[PDB]
Ligand binder design. Structure first.
Ligand code: HEM
Ligand SMILES: CC[C@@H]1C(=O)OC[C@@H]1Cc1cncn1C
Length: 463
């Protein structure tokens, strides 16, 4: 009645059929044997795995409500503990998601206000890149510093200074723990956390980075508290603190300190690392494909010129750039196995029975590479998103933000950011790699919770 799967063993589950370094390939390999909907045992964790566009959409959209539970990610769980918008369920989820979305729009998200803040931050990126003077640099932290400062404005009320030493450490905490969950040990940790949380190893260093992140947010919330102005909130924290006061006499409130810290961390973390990873990966692809870089240039120069900052609406007259960013997001597949769902009630899903509470892995990468939707899914080709007339072409299999009732509500911000950061950088610079285009390796460094591109250095050269 449960979907079919390989026969597990007590405690280790499907250990023998799973290569923890490449969980994605391991899971896809077994679906070729059992079909697109199958059961797996990640140690004692029983998970139903959804592969391909059809399986994922049918579950997460067509049976949207039944599949709207949030599952676990054991590493982030160590810090969040089911608190915060991301890992919440039921009433907690309802309240915090609703609140978060509204307060984000209230601070400019999806509006003129945050476009300007992205624009301003992009100029600061251009300045920093200008300052390198075309030298061979690691782009990692130039990018993350810029991305992070958009969401930081919303939640903390101001950007960090680029020379802020603490800001860099915050960014390292985010990079290191994100990377960890993408490694072989990280993915083993998803199977065996009940043991591994108490053992020495890479898990502990990731925990202490998560701890550093929690500590800063806690600290920021306290400062905000002692200086709070109930009539004029400066940031996301303030709005949340204001609601906490309004709800002090409701004993079943979801608005209390721990949910504040964790939601704030959720957004600071998700609002920094993913766009940063996507950008980092984008530029590596662009250097691998010099001819794609040239069309991006051709379009930018013809549509925007050189004398003004790119803006969000330039999107509509830039089908190629839109296709390029989509392909980067499709190819880069930053969240390859989505973020775990779970069934809200006993569920009938296409001839299978899934008991209430059953965890679900929506294999987002398998949709992004679904051969029914993209002609050459393993290649980087912006034509995946283009008409024969050269106009932009939507895809139902373009699901990097996932789909359904618990989909990424940072999508708006992220789309704007990607459009602005990519265009403004490509407008002002051309890219020079350390190695020859043929020698560049755009295969991932790590694939686990996230897809991480290999470490590289590069030059940003003025046009
Ligand atoms: C390229 C950029 C991004 C990608 C690819 C991405 C991807 C994802 C994915 C795959 C999920 C799981 C959705 C699901 O459960 O079906 C998710 C959830 C989430 N993301 Fe993003 N994200 C991005 C940027 C952002 C940003 C900028 C923010 C904050 C402004 C953000 C905040 C969140 C939150 C709060 C959730 C959980 C929503 C919930 O549980 O209700 N993300 N994201
Ligand atoms: C680590 C970032 C977010 C968090 O706090 O816990 C899980 C979540 C993952 C995520 C959501 N949107 C983008 N990412 C990378």
């Amino acid at each position: 009645k449960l979907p079919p799967g390989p026969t597990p063993l007590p405690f280790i589950g499907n250990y023998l059929q799973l290569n923890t370094e490449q969980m994605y390939n391991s899971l896809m390999k077994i679906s070729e044997r059992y079909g697109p909907v199958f059961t797996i045992h990640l140690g004692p964790r029983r998970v139903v795995v959804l592969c391909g566009h059809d399986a994922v959409r049918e579950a997460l959209v067509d049976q949207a409500e039944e599949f709207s539970g949030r599952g676990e990610q054991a590493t982030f769980d160590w810090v969040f503990k089911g608190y915060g918008v991301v890992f919440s369920n039921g009433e907690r989820a309802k309240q915090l998601r609703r609140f978060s979305i509204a307060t984000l729009r209230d601070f400019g998200v999806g509006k003129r206000g945050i476009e300007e803040r992205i624009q301003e931050e992009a100029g600061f990126l251009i300045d920093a890149l200008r300052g390198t003077g075309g030298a061979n640099i690691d782009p990692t932290f130039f990018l993350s510093r810029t991305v992070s400062n958009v969401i930081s404005s919303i939640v903390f009320g101001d950007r960090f200074d680029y020379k802020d030493k603490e800001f860099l450490s915050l960014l390292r905490m985010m990079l290191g723990s994100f990377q960890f969950t993408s490694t072989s040990t990280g993915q083993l940790y998803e199977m065996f956390s009940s043991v591994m949380k108490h053992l020495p190893g890479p898990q502990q260093q990731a925990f202490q980075l998560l701890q550093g992140l929690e500590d800063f947010i806690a600290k920021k919330v306290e400062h905000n508290q002692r200086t709070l102005d109930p009539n004029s909130p400066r940031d996301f924290i303030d709005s949340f603190l204001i609601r906490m006061q309004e709800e002090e006499k409701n004993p079943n409130t979801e608005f209390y300190l721990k949910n504040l810290v964790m939601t704030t961390l959720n957004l600071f973390f998700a609002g920094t690392e993913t766009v940063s990873t996507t950008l980092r990966y984008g530029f590596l692809l662009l250097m691998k494909h010099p001819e794609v870089e040239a069309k991006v240039h051709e379009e930018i120069d013809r549509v925007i010129g050189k004398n003004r900052q790119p803006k969000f609406e330039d999107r509509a007259k830039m089908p190629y750039m839109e296709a390029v960013i989509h392909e980067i997001q499709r190819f880069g597949d930053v969240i390859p196995m989505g973020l775990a769902r779970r069934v809200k009630k006993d569920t009938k899903f296409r001839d299978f029975f899934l008991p209430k509470g059953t965890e679900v892995y929506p294999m987002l990468g398998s949709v992004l590479r679904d051969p029914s939707f993209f002609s050459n899914p393993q290649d980087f080709n912006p034509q995946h998103f283009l008409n024969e007339k050269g106009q932009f072409k939507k895809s139902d299999a373009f699901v990097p933000f996932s789909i359904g009732k618990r989909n990424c509500f940072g999508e708006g911000l992220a789309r704007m950011e990607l459009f602005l950061f990519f265009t403004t950088v490509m407008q002002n610079f051309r890219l020079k790699s350390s190695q020859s285009p043929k020698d560049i390796d755009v295969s991932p460094k790590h694939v686990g919770f996230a897809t991480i591109p290999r470490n590289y250095t590069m030059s940003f050269l003025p046009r």
